[PDB]
Ligand binder design. Structure first.
Ligand code: 6PC
Ligand code: 6PC
Ligand code: CA
Ligand code: V
Length: 223
């Protein structure tokens, strides 16, 4: 997250870190057994880490639980990142508490201009690299679909939206992939892709979770 702030320990209690020997992507806890992340975060051997603030220090509220199964969206396209969503099942249910909590799925899509909270452990530099070990947060509005498509012609589908600031300075970045975009208490986005970080006229692009709620519900009920 570039241009954000230190969230505070466990202030985003649905935020997960996906670990394969190291943090590589975020995700969002949607019930005690299931996490939503980006399909472009798929790999075998995922451990889900819940209750994290500093990802390099055991602070006492963590739960580390191996994934039993991953389900990439059936229409995921790794070239275009269309349908950039995946479900991860925990081998054992998480113990839900104030620091390890689920986020609700949308009942409807969010409007342009709605303010959202984006979070992650990604790079905090727009020019260079520095990784925070504690969770970063960013308040950012959903941008109009027209501003989004203007920035990325022929690359935006109905399954994507842009959020952030066209003037630059504030954005998601490397290591934020898969993490949450929460708006009005609902998981509306997944950190998906962009061009650079926090550059002018190159906002972040996010998977439009509201399009996938039926798929999520049906998939988790059958797995
Ligand atoms: O460089 C990355 O890994 C990146 C950038 C933007 C969004 C997600 N990931
Ligand atoms: O392509 C990306 O954005 C990416 C891939 C792997 C881990 C984090 N991000
Ligand atoms: Ca920790
Ligand atoms: V990434």
């Amino acid at each position: 997250i570039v241009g954000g702030y230190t969230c505070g320990a466990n202030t985003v209690p649905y935020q997960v870190s996906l670990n394969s020997g190291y943090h590589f992507c975020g995700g969002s806890l949607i019930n005690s057994q299931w996490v939503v992340s980006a399909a472009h975060c798929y790999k075998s051997g995922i451990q889900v880490r819940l209750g994290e603030d500093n990802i390099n220090v055991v602070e006492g509220n963590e739960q580390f639980i191996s994934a039993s199964k991953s389900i990439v969206h059936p229409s995921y396209n790794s070239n275009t990142l269309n349908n950039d969503i995946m479900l991860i099942k925990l081998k054992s249910a998480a113990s839900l508490n104030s620091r390890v909590a689920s986020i609700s799925l949308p009942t409807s899509c969010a409007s342009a201009g709605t303010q959202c909270l984006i979070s992650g452990w990604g790079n905090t530099k727009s020019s260079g690299t520095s990784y925070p070990d504690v969770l970063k947060c960013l308040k950012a509005p959903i941008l109009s679909d027209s501003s989004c498509k203007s920035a990325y012609p022929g690359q935006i589908t109905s399954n994507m939206f842009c959020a952030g600031y066209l003037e630059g300075g504030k954005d998601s970045c490397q290591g934020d992939s898969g993490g949450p975009v929460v708006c009005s208490g609902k998981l509306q986005g997944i950190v998906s892709w962009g061009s650079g970080c926090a550059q002018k006229n190159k906002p972040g692009v996010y998977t439009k979770v509201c399009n996938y709620v039926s798929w999520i519900k049906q998939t988790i009920a059958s797995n």
